[PDB]
């Protein structure tokens, strides 16, 4: 009862304890802190990702379904740290959103004004944190993504998800039906030499209808390997840790719209597939689906921890109106552009007017 939040009366509670609680005839307690761990890049600590959430659901259901617990409330708990508490609460909220179809205001009401508060989530970069997203942001972002059809736990493949996250298999995530974010391949191209992660990426892309690869970082491989399997390769390079000029973003959004119209996927990489990649995919998600910047960051990190780094967060925050309202102030060009390899860029309403008269 103490340090315990009611989610469903006599049914589901969220606790935070520095001791090990004892099951009683009315209560069963479980923590997953020893089983489901967030892998920190630097000082990021959460939120837990969709694979973690899927495994939490399996555990939760197994405990709920145990005959011995038929007449007990279930208390999911963490340790008392504000970081561990934030991860546990956010994961339980994501469970209710994705599995039980609760809405954000329903999962947020039990968490509001808890003392001590939950630690807000920070980015994965090395500079001191200066931007935070909350459980409220993550919940709204995951809910909106589910409502737009971008998350579907029915078809979610946990084994595929966990495998391809690994560096040795290419360090990538399918983010949505349209986008993959990945770390740059690396090779020593001779002046049969591809390493296992590169072959794994090429195989997956060939099997999963990737039609465009966008490279955002300095070259670490020869693009011919993607063109060898029929995939268009595009450089839109900008420097590590920086935010892309809006001219790059407009070119990227038009390239992506062009491929999506053909039914294809776009795979985007920078060095790590986190910051620069998050800028561009994030811009497109906001343009398409109307996420807030904080929701977009929360959804991206729920699928691929660490996306959008440092000042890129404030950049996405400050340009989110621009991206959303490009639906009204821009059009896809009628004319293909050599800057994006013959795909069609976003252009201003006025140029599109000229083209159309």
């Amino acid at each position: 009862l103490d340090n315990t939040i009611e989610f469903l009366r006599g049914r589901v509670y969220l606790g935070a304890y520095d001791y090990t609680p004892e099951d009683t005839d009315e209560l069963v307690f479980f923590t997953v802190e020893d089983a489901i761990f967030y892998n920190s890049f630097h000082l990021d600590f959460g939120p837990m990702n969709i694979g973690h959430l899927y495994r939490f659901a399996v555990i939760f259901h197994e405990i709920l379904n145990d005959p011995e617990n038929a007449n007990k409330a279930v208390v999911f708990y963490s340790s008392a740290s504000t970081r561990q508490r934030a991860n546990a609460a956010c994961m339980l909220c994501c469970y209710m959103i994705l599995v039980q179809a609760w809405t954000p205001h329903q999962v947020l009401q039990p968490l509001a004004q808890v003392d001590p508060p939950f630690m807000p989530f920070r980015d994965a970069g090395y500079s001191n944190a200066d931007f935070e997203i909350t459980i409220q942001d993550v919940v709204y972002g995951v809910w909106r993504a589910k409502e737009k059809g971008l998350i579907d736990l029915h078809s979610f493949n946990l084994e595929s998800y966990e495998k391809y996250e690994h560096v040795e298999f290419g360090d990538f995530n399918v983010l949505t039906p349209d986008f993959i974010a990945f770390a740059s391949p690396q090779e020593d191209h001779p002046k049969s030499h591809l390493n296992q992660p590169f072959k794994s990426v090429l195989n997956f892309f060939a099997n999963n209808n990737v039609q465009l690869v966008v490279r955002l970082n300095s070259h670490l491989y020869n693009k011919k390997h993607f063109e060898d399997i029929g995939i268009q390769h595009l450089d839109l390079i900008f420097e590590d840790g920086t935010c892309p000029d809006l001219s790059i973003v407009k070119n990227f959004v038009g390239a992506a719209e062009t491929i999506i119209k053909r039914g294809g996927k776009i795979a985007v990489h920078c060095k790590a597939g986190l910051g620069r990649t998050g800028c561009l995919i994030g811009a497109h998600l906001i343009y398409t689906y109307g996420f807030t910047a904080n929701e977009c960051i929360g959804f991206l990190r729920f699928i691929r921890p660490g996306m959008v780094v440092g000042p890129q967060q404030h950049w996405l925050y400050l340009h989110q109106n621009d991206f959303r309202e490009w639906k009204y102030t821009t059009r896809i060009s009628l004319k293909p552009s050599e800057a994006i390899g013959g795909l069609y860029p976003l252009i201003s309403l006025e140029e599109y007017r000229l083209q159309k008269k």
Partner: peptide
């Protein structure tokens, strides 16, 4: 989740 318990919002 096949046999997923019903935990409807309150």
């Amino acid at each position: 989740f096949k046999n997923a318990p019903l935990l409807a919002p309150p």
